[PDB]
Design a protein around this nucleic acid. Structure first.
Lengths: 136, 138
DNA sequence: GCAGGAAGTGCTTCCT
DNA sequence: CAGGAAGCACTTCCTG
């Protein structure tokens, strides 16, 4: 073990940041403004967020342990004080048809990315789970 | 001078900071995502941009001495590599009815905020001209 | 170039 | 928590 490695290891974050920052992806995609899912994706790639939202451990399956908090952030990111899970949800509903994210029937505040993320990001759920230290 | 002094002294600096940053305005008003007018307003209060965009010295009237650049920066802002004044001018054309901006008749690339920024921003056009050493056109 | 109609984009609002 | 249906602020096109 040398300083070379030390830097290498610290390279993979440890630092204080989200594996896939929304803005960045929006730039690599050129999708213009930031979209809901992109926002979430960053949430789910930042260990600091795992408290109110995280993955279930099953593929692109994730859960919103504390919606109100998520909706708080989403709204605050697009300067929308009157934001809430009620509205935020509606945004998600529009993702069903578009095949971007779907709902886990039977479970509340449980959804799953259905789009081809592995090929877009170049990361597999497990890689992410590992990096994020997902429990289940 | 104590510490707060030493702080304010060195903190007094911006040099590159625009008087009205679009995001902050969006924030204070909760207008949601940044909007083109709030954007242009940012650049007009950013001395650095006087090159391609600046005030005419009259009220809130201004000009785009170099559309193209403005277009590109704005395109960059919202991730729109295809942006150009041609499309951006469209945006601006929907403010005429919303009574936000209004194009000064008989001139090219010359519009004029017509909403009530004074009340909103707390500054008067003249105060801002001063802060930006603006030189009237003829 | 600049005034607008027209259609699409993506959430954000409203409401049944 | 769901939809259906409007809004809103542009982004893209096209016409004159």
């Amino acid at each position: 073990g040398t300083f070379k490695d030390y830097v290498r290891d610290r390279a993979d974050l440890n630092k204080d940041k989200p594996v896939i920052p929304a803005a960045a992806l929006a730039g690599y995609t050129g999708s213009g403004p930031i979209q809901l899912w992109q926002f979430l994706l960053e949430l789910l790639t930042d260990k600091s967020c795992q408290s109110f939202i995280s993955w279930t451990g099953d593929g692109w399956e994730f859960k919103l342990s504390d919606p109100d908090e998520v909706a708080r952030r989403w709204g605050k990111r697009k300067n929308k004080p009157k934001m809430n899970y009620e509205k935020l949800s509606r945004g998600l509903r529009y993702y069903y048809d578009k095949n971007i994210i779907h709902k886990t029937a039977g479970k509340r505040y449980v959804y799953r990315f259905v789009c081809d993320l592995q090929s877009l990001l170049g990361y597999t759920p497990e890689e992410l789970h590992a990096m994020l230290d997902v429990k289940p």
